[PDB]
Amino acid sequence: AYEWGVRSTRKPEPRPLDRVYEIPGLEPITYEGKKHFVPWLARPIFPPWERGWNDPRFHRAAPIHEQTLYKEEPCYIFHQRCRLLEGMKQALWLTKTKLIEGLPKKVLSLVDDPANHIENQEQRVLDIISHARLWHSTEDIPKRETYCPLIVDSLIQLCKSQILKHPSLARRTSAQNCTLATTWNRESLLLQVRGTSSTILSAKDPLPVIASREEVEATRSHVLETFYPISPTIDLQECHVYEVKDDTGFQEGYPYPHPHTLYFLEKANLRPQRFLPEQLRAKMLLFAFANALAQARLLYGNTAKVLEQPIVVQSVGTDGRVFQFLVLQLNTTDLASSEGVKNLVWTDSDQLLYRHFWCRPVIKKKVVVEPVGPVDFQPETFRKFLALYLHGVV
Amino acid sequence: KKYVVHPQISALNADRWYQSFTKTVFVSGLPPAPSLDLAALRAAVCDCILQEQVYVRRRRPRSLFDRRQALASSILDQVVRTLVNLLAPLNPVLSTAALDCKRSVDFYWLRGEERIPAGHRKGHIDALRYQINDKPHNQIRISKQLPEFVPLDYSIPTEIPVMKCKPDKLPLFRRQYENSIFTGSKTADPCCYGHTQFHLIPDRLKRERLIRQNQAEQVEAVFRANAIASLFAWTGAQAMYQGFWSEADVTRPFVSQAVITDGKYFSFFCYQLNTLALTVQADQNNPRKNLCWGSQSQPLYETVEDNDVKGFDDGTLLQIVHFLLNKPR
Amino acid sequence: GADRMSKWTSKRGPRTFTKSRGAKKTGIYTSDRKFVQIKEMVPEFVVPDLTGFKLKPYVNYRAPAGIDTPLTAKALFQETVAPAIEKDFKEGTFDANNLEKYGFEPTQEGKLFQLYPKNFPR
Amino acid sequence: ARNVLYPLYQLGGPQLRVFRTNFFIQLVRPGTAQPEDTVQFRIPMEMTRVDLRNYLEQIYNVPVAAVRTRVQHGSNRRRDHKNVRIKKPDYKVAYVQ
Amino acid sequence: GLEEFFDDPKNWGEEKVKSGASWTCQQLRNKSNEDLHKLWYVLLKERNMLLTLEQEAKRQRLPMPSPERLEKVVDSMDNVDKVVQEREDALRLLQTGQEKPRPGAWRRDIFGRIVWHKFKQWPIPWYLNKRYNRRRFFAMPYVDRFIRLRIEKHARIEARKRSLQKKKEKILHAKF
Amino acid sequence: RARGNEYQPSNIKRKHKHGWVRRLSTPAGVQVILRRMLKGRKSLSH
RNA sequence: GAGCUACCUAAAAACAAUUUUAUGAAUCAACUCGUCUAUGUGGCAAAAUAGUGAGAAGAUUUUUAGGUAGAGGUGAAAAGCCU
RNA sequence: UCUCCAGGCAUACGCGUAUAACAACUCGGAUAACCAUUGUUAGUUAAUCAGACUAUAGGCAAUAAUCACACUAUAAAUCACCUAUAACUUCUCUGUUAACCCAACACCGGAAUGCCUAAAGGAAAGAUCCAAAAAGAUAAAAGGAACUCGGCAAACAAGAACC
Ligand SMILES: [Mg+2]
Ligand SMILES: [Mg+2]
Ligand SMILES: [Mg+2]
Ligand SMILES: [Mg+2]
Ligand SMILES: [Mg+2]
Ligand SMILES: [Mg+2]
Ligand SMILES: [Mg+2]
Ligand SMILES: [Mg+2]
Ligand SMILES: [Mg+2]
Ligand SMILES: [Mg+2]
Ligand SMILES: [Mg+2]
Ligand SMILES: [Mg+2]
Ligand SMILES: [Mg+2]
Ligand SMILES: [Mg+2]
Ligand SMILES: [Mg+2]
Ligand SMILES: [Mg+2]
Ligand SMILES: [Mg+2]
Ligand SMILES: [Mg+2]
Ligand SMILES: [Mg+2]
Ligand SMILES: [Mg+2]
Ligand SMILES: [Mg+2]
Ligand SMILES: [Mg+2]
Ligand SMILES: [Mg+2]
Ligand SMILES: [Mg+2]
Ligand SMILES: [Mg+2]
Ligand SMILES: [Mg+2]
Ligand SMILES: [Mg+2]
């Protein structure tokens, strides 16, 4: 079997010890007294050195087996960079959930009412796109690490202007770069999630439940799909030094205990560093599911049971052009077994706000084929964005 | 080659120098000249302070020196977004405004002349060039201009300072690079006017450090220099977007406001632009001049104990609300 | 065509070449590229109070100068240590073990001002 | 102090104190025109701007607000009767406000 | 204040300034350590004023008044320095017996010469310091030829010097 | 083409090719220094 | 002794307008090279100047640092080049 | 003030006081004026421009670029994020001038990148005269390769065919 690492690049073996050391009963004469090396005297052997006090700049870590938090059983941790090979199918298995395509009917209807329409909605949306892609910068072509965050903040500001119609929108706030974690078990596997959110919208009141108890119970017929020979833990980080923690994102006593929506961004300029659509959706489920579970465990303790009051959380993710929407309902905390009542998730995938943008006009033979600005704008996508924001008030 | 002007700078008496570079007169005070549940706003603002300091959970900064500065940035961003949100019903214009975070403002102008002192070009006459490159923490841009604070051609007896030495003696250095005039967005954007700016002072210039360096008298001067440079740049860029330059001077005054905070103390300033004719050629017979009004720094609160903010002052909160409630006529 | 004889300083060479002119360091550089000054590393001038002092830069021409006698280790020992030992020896209360009583120091460790190796400047 | 060794400092060490000072300075008339507050000095090449602040405040009881320094290259162009270059020494200039 | 960097305003423009003699070593020895510490700064401020005046005279292209004042002050400061050194030197001998404050050793360099090496301060012991280990304190056998060449070269210089002295004496005896 | 300009000065190259650390790196270079010391050269290396 | 030149390694950079297409294509600047003629010949220059010419998105040109040394190195072989 | 000409300003590399004022009139500039020369005194100021800038141990990566969307193609193509340990408020040091470098010279030569093309930067004639020969430019009656080794060079031509 080929061994990696050619010998010439490896550190060289220590010099052989002087033969005078072999002879028993003889004291070698070395250059230790001189305090410097000479080629014609024996090489001293020194005992290991101890400073006698701690210098912070030269601290040295103890080995893994000596760590106080070392545990023989392994914990698999899912974090931002993890990219699941099987995509959604693997994500559903880990979270014991059933998938429904399309958004819930209640949320969709919120925007069909023309009363919820914003004034000059289509024109204002077009301006935000142009500002994000061209106008905000002094450069000729801005980069994704700037406009991808910018488009989302501007859209939130547009929707947030609806407080004039609905005074009840003053009961929610938003934070930046909050963190979330949860520990749970699936079929003898210890699993943990460590993550962060770009922005988190929190409300003072819980969201309405989506599915009735009858629908929740009917899920028992559904069976979670498997993907042999690939294990469920492929692409997760195996850790032997870990601590069990749960985190919603705020400490106890926060006036707005109900998280409303979670936002996730793909702002990397280079394509290989950006999650693909399916892998982005898988990340959204686990991160959102962790937020819901941590909130549950907080209220009902560490016991496992089917929840009397299901918890609902929303999630939105984008790279600045394509948008994906998510709604999750947490029905049970008894995840050890693979059979029983299952959680439910609604997904709307690959929603294009615009197809392309030109920062300079396209000229062929002194004819302007394409003017600057968005191409093939689709207003439908924003309405789905607006509907999720309004949910829970209107 | 052009001098580079820093709004936030540690040099002594920078404000007096910036007046000469700009032809601005500074008046201490405020410009000559509906209940909204002030208690509710007090609750909302206190929520913002406590959320970032005591409730949010986020990864600690590595540096250990960015921690204090990073905290102060978080609260100021939260305060601006809420106050702008809460006050939208009373002032409808705030609903259609555009809110910017750490975007760039640029201005380039000519003022003065000098003789080249050495080399093969010795004796030739050259203009003195300046540029301001700035990045305000927050700013609001609207699509309609605000009303004036005093009529154009307003005259007061106070005299602009005159400096004997060259700008170099105030530590100030030159470079050659692109000249830019920028309001925060390109000319194609509809929102071409300014409403208010929010600034956060670097930790290097805060009150405690200055006292140790023995320049206690410079605590207030730092605030003034930041306002004069930042607001002169923003108004000048706005005017040139309307087509006015040194040889076609402004016909209507341009106005804007700013609040400058070091994290706890706050001060308030207003600026009016009357002249873009600052060059030697265009300034030979010009009686106009630019005006700036400012106030001394006042604390907004003192400390956070348990989960309660202690020392909240309503008087300062009124000034922030008054600035945000100004509207076009 | 280069000059071999003039001194090599930081004004010469490309940008990436730098060196000091002999000033002592006053702090440390961390990672993250931040300088951190240390207060104890900055020298402190100990200046006495000069009020009511009778001595001035110059001396009168009528002041008699004295024969030069540089101080030696023998002279210091006789003036300071010899008298005490002589009295105790007459009384008989003297032993070699208690030389520290007369001011002898076995080792310089622990002292703020060590005489060898010197740990303080002028 | 110049031409002397400083004790090496490690975490938790004493303060460094120099009882007798080896630095000598001279006040010079500005060649150019300077602001009214500013003063010029010639200082030894080993002195730092921090040292000048403490030197003036403690020895001379003068309050100082800022300090800036530069190194001036001395000419090495003049030659002696055997055609050997003469070097004018490099020196340091300090501006005190 | 800054006024101490100049002479008494009355003296400005005068051709001469009266001054006394510089401090001798023996007179200083009578004084105590505390007195000497204060006397140092009294001399120091006089030194700065004299250096200031010297430079200003060059700028105005005029002779410096009473330039001998500077030499006296510099001599005085030197005597103060040694007197303090004498006291420290004696005390070190009594307590430690060492003749030098700084540690050192006699070593051979790579060129075959014998030089005194002054030690430096380090936070770690020598056998763990990789920058120090690259320094060599020995000479290899190709240096032996150059050691002989140096010895012979020094021998020629001495012979010529003694020969010249003998010839010069011949001239003196003839003349006188 | 016109010759006479083969010296294209560069301080980094000059110190690496003919400098003090370079001369001491080999025994042949150390003997270069010894010869110039015996002659009495004022400049041992670049 | 490879700061010139020959070849290689690493990190960087430049290429307008027009016609074709989809390219060691075309016209022609920048830039690189050097066909032909005259002037010059201790010359402005120990190989240049003035015109006129070849290539100019490629086996292209250019910058910085490193490598190979004389019984040798390098070479789209001219017994070329290596201050 | 007028007449005419049309690569300038910055950075990198290199150079090392040639920088500025006054004074000199010896030497230097291939001559004067004036200095680039001689002597004396002065100068370049940064937590942002530029350089240097030592916490430790583990775990882990299928998906280019080109307005990156569509779109294919072939030569297959720039630390992050997590897990634990430790520390728990800071500004000193160095570069900064110039008409400048490599070519024996104040050499019609060579010299990387960014912006811009006159708003920046400059002067072909020391005075006079109007010969020969020599060099460069422009115009020419009638004829149009008869010139020459050869349409070399020049031309109101700058096109075609074949070995
Ligand atoms: Mg040569
Ligand atoms: Mg090479
Ligand atoms: Mg080359
Ligand atoms: Mg092209
Ligand atoms: Mg060729
Ligand atoms: Mg061809
Ligand atoms: Mg061609
Ligand atoms: Mg081609
Ligand atoms: Mg052949
Ligand atoms: Mg042949
Ligand atoms: Mg040769
Ligand atoms: Mg000059
Ligand atoms: Mg003159
Ligand atoms: Mg000169
Ligand atoms: Mg500096
Ligand atoms: Mg920097
Ligand atoms: Mg390093
Ligand atoms: Mg310069
Ligand atoms: Mg030549
Ligand atoms: Mg010549
Ligand atoms: Mg010009
Ligand atoms: Mg003529
Ligand atoms: Mg003709
Ligand atoms: Mg004819
Ligand atoms: Mg014929
Ligand atoms: Mg014939
Ligand atoms: Mg021809």
Integer Cα distance of A68 and B220 in angstroms: 53
* Cβ neighbours for D23, distance < 8 A, ≥ 6 positions apart: D1, D2, D43, D44, D47, D51, D55
Tokens of B102: 């750490």
Specify the DSSP element, H or E, that contains B268: strand B265-273
Among the partner-chain residues A38, A39, A46, the one whose CB lies closest to the CB of E127 is: A46
**Residue D62 touches chain E, beta carbons under 8 Å:** yes
Tokens of B192: 């071409």
Closest by CA to C116, choosing from E102, E91, D8, is E102
**Could you write out the three-class secondary structure of B45-106?**
HHHHHHHHHHHECCCCCCCCCHHHHHHHHHHHHHHHHHHHHHCCCCCCHHHHCEEEECCCEE
Name the residue closest to the C1' of G45 by its CA.
F2
Tokens of A128: 């935000």
CB A333 within 8 A of CB A162: no
Integer Cα distance of A355 and B186 in angstroms: 23
- E:123-142 residues touching chain F, CB 8 A cutoff: 140, 142
Start-to-end CA span in chain D (Å): 24
Give exposure, B7-27, as e/b (b: 16+ Cβ within 10 Å).
Answer: bbbbbbbbbbbbbebbbbbbe
Positive or negative torsion for Cα C13, C15, C16, C20: positive
Strand pairing of A362-363 and A189-203?
unpaired
Start-to-end CA span in chain B (Å): 42
Integer Cα distance of E43 and C55 in angstroms: 10
The answer to whether the peptide bond before residue B287 is cis (omega within 30 degrees of 0) is: no
Integer Cα distance of C72 and C58 in angstroms: 28
Phi, psi dihedrals of residue A49, rounded to the nearest 5°:
-100, 140
Residues of chain B positioned with their CB less than 8 A from the CB of D68: 171
Integer Cα distance of A171 and D78 in angstroms: 82
**Residue E115 touches chain F, beta carbons under 8 Å:** no
Find residue C28's DSSP bridge partners: C36
Closest by CA to A132, choosing from A120, A142, A123, is A142
Tokens of A232: 């469920």
For residues C13, C19, C22 and C27, what is the CA-based torsion angle, rounded to 10 degrees? Answer: 150
Name the residue closest to the C1' of H39 by its CA.
D78
Integer Cα distance of A144 and A156 in angstroms: 18
* Cβ neighbours for E42, distance < 8 A, ≥ 6 positions apart: C50, C53, C55, C56, C57
Specify the DSSP element, H or E, that contains A331: strand A322-332
Using DSSP's 3-state secondary structure scheme, residue B7 falls into: coil
Using DSSP's 3-state secondary structure scheme, residue A163 falls into: helix
Specify the DSSP element, H or E, that contains D96: strand D91-96
| Touch test E–B: 3 Cβ pairs or more under 8 Å | no
Helix axis angle for B314-324 and B66-86, nearest 10°, is 60
Closest CA of chain A from B57, distance in Å: 5
Tokens of B127: 């203009």
Integer Cα distance of A231 and A188 in angstroms: 14
Alpha helix locations (H) across chain D? 49-59
Integer Cα distance of A116 and A394 in angstroms: 9
F14: CA distance to ligand 2 center in Å?
13
Integer Cα distance of D90 and D74 in angstroms: 5
* Cβ neighbours for A372, distance < 8 A, ≥ 6 positions apart: A134, A358, A359, A360, A361
Q: What angle do CA A149, A155, A161 make, to 5 degrees?
A: 140
Q: Report the 10 Å Cβ neighbour count for A107.
A: 20
Residue type, A204: K
The distance (Å) linking the CA of E155 with the C1' of G64 is 53
**Residue F21 touches chain E, beta carbons under 8 Å:** no
Choose the mutation target among F20, F34, F36, F45 for the interface with E, i.e. most E CBs under 10 Å.
Answer: F34
CB A74 within 8 A of CB A238: yes
Query: Which bases of chain G are contacted by protein, using any atom under 7 A from a CB?
Result: 1-4, 19, 34, 45-48, 64-66, 83
Closest residue in B to A123 (Cα) is: B190
Choose the mutation target among D16, D60, D93, D97 for the interface with E, i.e. most E CBs under 10 Å.
Answer: D60
Closest CA of chain F from C3, distance in Å: 9
CB A354 within 8 A of CB A374: yes
Surface-to-core class of residue A250, CB atoms within 10 Å of its CB (0-12 exposed, 13-18 middle, 19+ buried): buried
Q: What DSSP state is assigned to residue A133?
A: I
Chains that touch C (3 or more CB pairs under 8 A): B, D, E, F
Nucleotide nearest to D11 (CA to C1'): H87
Q: Is the CB of F6 under 7 A from strand G?
A: yes
Residue type, A39: P
Integer Cα distance of B80 and B102 in angstroms: 13
Q: Report the 10 Å Cβ neighbour count for E133.
A: 12
Tokens of E154: 């020094």
Phi, psi dihedrals of residue E153, rounded to the nearest 5°:
-60, -40
Positive or negative torsion for Cα A375, A377, A381, A385: positive
Q: What DSSP state is assigned to residue D30?
A: -
Surface-to-core class of residue F28, CB atoms within 10 Å of its CB (0-12 exposed, 13-18 middle, 19+ buried): exposed
Method used to determine the 3D structure: cryo-EM
Start-to-end CA span in chain A (Å): 66
Surface-to-core class of residue B52, CB atoms within 10 Å of its CB (0-12 exposed, 13-18 middle, 19+ buried): buried
Q: How many Cα atoms sit within 13 Å of A202 on the Cβ side? A: 23
Residues of chain F positioned with their CB less than 8 A from the CB of E146: 34, 38
Integer Cα distance of A75 and B276 in angstroms: 67
DSSP string, A74-85: EEEEE-TT---S
Taking each continuous run of H as one helix and of E as one strand, the counts in chain F are 3, 0
Strand pairing of B254-261 and E114-118?
unpaired
Closest by CA to A124, choosing from A377, A361, A390, A393, is A377
Tokens of A55: 């210098």
Closest CA of chain C from E95, distance in Å: 6
Closest CA of chain E from A29, distance in Å: 17
Closest residue in D to E5 (Cα) is: D27
Range A188-192 contact pairs with CB under 8 angstroms and sequence separation of 24 or more: A189/A76, A189/A232, A189/A233, A190/A73, A190/A74, A190/A75, A190/A76, A191/A75, A191/A76, A191/A78, A191/A94, A191/A236, A192/A75, A192/A76, A192/A77, A192/A78, A192/A239, A192/A242, A192/A244
Tokens of B316: 């300062």
Closest residue in D to B213 (Cα) is: D65
Choose the mutation target among C60, C108, C116, C118 for the interface with E, i.e. most E CBs under 10 Å.
Answer: C116
**Residue E123 touches chain D, beta carbons under 8 Å:** yes
Integer Cα distance of A367 and A361 in angstroms: 10
Give exposure, A117-155, as e/b (b: 16+ Cβ within 10 Å).
Answer: eeeeeeeebbbbbbbbbbbbbeeeebebebbbbbbbbbb
**Residue E129 touches chain A, beta carbons under 8 Å:** no
Residue type, C60: N
Q: What angle do CA B93, B98, B102 make, to 5 degrees?
A: 140
CB B239 within 8 A of CB B272: no
CB contact under 8 A, D10 and A55: yes
Using DSSP's 3-state secondary structure scheme, residue B320 falls into: helix
Using DSSP's 3-state secondary structure scheme, residue E104 falls into: strand
**Residue F37 touches chain E, beta carbons under 8 Å:** yes
Task: Give Cα separations from A134 to A63, A153, A377, D85, E136 (angstroms).
Answer: 52, 16, 16, 62, 64
Strand pairing of D17-18 and C44-45?
parallel
CB A204 within 8 A of CB A172: yes
Q: Report the 10 Å Cβ neighbour count for B192.
A: 20
Tokens of A288: 């959102």
Rounded to the nearest angstrom, the gap between the alpha carbon of residue F22 and the centroid of all alpha carbons in its chain is 8
Tokens of B88: 């939208």
Find residue D41's DSSP bridge partners: D27, D94
Integer Cα distance of C21 and C10 in angstroms: 9
Integer Cα distance of E26 and C68 in angstroms: 6
CB A347 within 8 A of CB A99: yes
The distance (Å) linking the CA of B165 with the C1' of H157 is 71
Phi, psi dihedrals of residue B169, rounded to the nearest 5°:
-65, -40
Residue type, E117: H
Residues of chain A positioned with their CB less than 8 A from the CB of B47: 173, 255
CB B253 within 8 A of CB B148: yes
DSSP string, A191-221: EEEEEEEEEEEEESSPPPP-S-HHHHHHGGG
Nucleotide nearest to A360 (CA to C1'): H67
Residue type, B208: E
Closest residue in E to A43 (Cα) is: E127
Tokens of A137: 């910068």
The distance (Å) linking the CA of F20 with the C1' of G69 is 22
3-state helix, strand, coil in chain D (%, to 5): 10, 25, 65
Task: Tell me which residue has tokens 């600035």.
Answer: B323
CB contact under 8 A, C14 and F7: no
Phi, psi dihedrals of residue B125, rounded to the nearest 5°:
-95, 130
CB A151 within 8 A of CB A128: yes
* Cβ neighbours for C35, distance < 8 A, ≥ 6 positions apart: C27, C28, C29
CB contact under 8 A, E5 and D20: no
Nucleotide nearest to F46 (CA to C1'): G3
Strand pairing of C27-30 and D26-27?
unpaired
Q: Is the CB of F1 under 7 A from strand G?
A: yes
Closest by CA to A204, choosing from B44, E127, B35, is B44
Residue type, C88: D
Taking each continuous run of H as one helix and of E as one strand, the counts in chain D are 1, 5
Closest residue in A to E105 (Cα) is: A34
Phi-psi region of B176 (alpha: psi -120 to 50; beta: other; left: phi over 0): beta
The distance (Å) linking the CA of F11 with the C1' of H113 is 21
Positive or negative torsion for Cα D36, D41, D45, D48: negative
Q: Report the 10 Å Cβ neighbour count for A353.
A: 23
CB A307 within 8 A of CB A296: yes
Integer Cα distance of C14 and C17 in angstroms: 6
Integer Cα distance of A75 and A10 in angstroms: 33
Find residue B298's DSSP bridge partners: B266
Q: Is the CB of B166 under 7 A from strand H?
A: no
Tokens of E125: 């012991």
Length of chain D: 97
CB contact under 8 A, F27 and E140: yes
Tokens of B143: 């699509």
* Resolution in angstrom units: 2.9
Give exposure, A252-289, as e/b (b: 16+ Cβ within 10 Å).
Answer: eebebbbbbbbbbbbbeeeeeeebeebbbbbbbbbbbb
CB contact under 8 A, F9 and C4: no
Integer Cα distance of A70 and A241 in angstroms: 4
Task: Give Cα separations from A85 to A77, A268, A279 (angstroms).
Answer: 15, 20, 8
The distance (Å) linking the CA of B285 with the C1' of H118 is 29
Specify the DSSP element, H or E, that contains E86: helix E68-96
CB contact under 8 A, B165 and D97: no
Q: Report the 10 Å Cβ neighbour count for E64.
A: 15
For residues B113, B118, B119 and B121, what is the CA-based torsion angle, rounded to 10 degrees? Answer: 20
Task: Give Cα separations from E148 to D23, E107, F32, F33 (angstroms).
Answer: 47, 19, 17, 16
Using DSSP's 3-state secondary structure scheme, residue E154 falls into: helix
The distance (Å) linking the CA of B47 with the C1' of H11 is 52
Q: What DSSP state is assigned to residue B245?
A: B
CB contact under 8 A, F43 and C17: no
B174: CA distance to ligand 16 center in Å?
15
Task: Give Cα separations from A74 to A181, A185, A287, E106, F29 (angstroms).
Answer: 17, 12, 21, 61, 60
Q: Is the CB of F35 under 7 A from strand G?
A: no
Q: Is the CB of B10 under 7 A from strand H?
A: yes
Closest residue in B to A166 (Cα) is: B89
Q: What angle do CA A192, A198, A199 make, to 5 degrees?
A: 110
